[PDB]
């Protein structure tokens, strides 16, 4: 009945959800890590508390993973093209939204740790901005879950 | 691959859970370490 190529977009969604969010998480991890390794030289006592950005970035990857596996278990051989489109939409949503989030976390954390090396008070504002960054990935998860469930 | 690397991964991630997801709820963690004049000069 349904077109046989329908599954292609389902698997594309499944992949996208993980891959794009993972790219975002990777970039965030990298920038925050360089910032950490820089700040450590002058204020070595702050490294563990200041890792919070990498800790937050990994969460974008968690989000990517959850949407990916949900699309996966939703997939089957005979899905209708409508459903395959919803799966693609969910995957793209979470993945690219997480990519935007990851750029946000990377930049904010990289700047924040280096600043905190000179001003410990910034830490709190860093956390605030980082939350405002993660929420972008979170919203992508919300829309992706709604779409994939519909 | 598993015993050292995967084990270490799970190690640190569990540490991460207790640190971030759990302790944020009740734990402040801003106090000074008490390191008295405890004849530590043995080193």
């Amino acid at each position: 009945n349904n077109p046989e190529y329908s599954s292609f977009f389902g698997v594309m969604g499944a992949s996208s959800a993980m891959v794009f969010s993972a790219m975002g998480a990777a970039y965030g991890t990298a920038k925050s890590g360089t910032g950490i390794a820089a700040m450590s030289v002058m204020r070595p006592e702050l490294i563990m508390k200041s890792i919070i950005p990498v800790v937050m970035a990994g969460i974008i990857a968690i989000y990517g993973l959850v949407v990916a596996v949900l699309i996966a278990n939703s997939l089957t051989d005979g899905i209708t093209l409508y459903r395959s489109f919803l799966q693609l939409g969910a995957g793209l949503s979470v993945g690219l939204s997480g990519l935007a989030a990851g750029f946000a976390i990377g930049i904010v954390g990289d700047a924040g740790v280096r600043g905190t090396a000179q001003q410990p008070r910034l830490f709190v504002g860093m956390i605030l901005i980082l939350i405002f960054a993660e929420v972008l990935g979170l919203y992508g998860l919300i829309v992706a879950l709604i779409l994939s469930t519909k | 691959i598993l015993l050292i690397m995967e084990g270490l991964s799970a190690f640190l991630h569990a540490l991460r859970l207790h640190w971030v997801e759990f302790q944020n709820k009740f734990y402040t963690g801003t106090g000074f370490k008490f390191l008295p004049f405890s004849f530590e000069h043995i080193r």
């Binding site: - | 106090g31 008490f34 390191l35 008295p36 004049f37 405890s38 004849f39 043995i42």
Partner: protein, 97 residues
């Protein structure tokens, strides 16, 4: 118990200058107290007992020199296990000599 952290509190001490050293040495033997600095306003090298720390630093320098000579040589060093408190009396200067 470990259920929650310790109940620490602040305190202070008066004692005669001469007995200060011996009494704080007994507090070092005890080990349950942490000391503050009551004159941060000026450097530690400008307190009442500058020369006393200067000479301990120099004596430890010389002991490190002789220890380096020992390591270069073949004689061991005695890890006897004794860890006595340093005498407060002016036998300090005998050890110096």
């Amino acid at each position: 118990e470990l259920f929650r952290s310790e109940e620490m509190t602040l305190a202070q001490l008066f004692l005669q200058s001469e007995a200060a050293y011996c009494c704080v040495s007994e507090l070092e033997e005890l080990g349950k107290v942490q000391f503050r600095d009551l004159n941060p306003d000026v450097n530690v090298f400008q307190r009442k007992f500058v020369n006393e720390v200067r000479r301990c630093e120099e004596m430890d320098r010389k002991l490190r020199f002789v220890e380096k000579e020992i390591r270069k040589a073949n004689i061991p060093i005695m890890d006897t296990g004794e860890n006595p408190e340093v005498p407060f009396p002016r036998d300090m200067i005998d050890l110096e000599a």
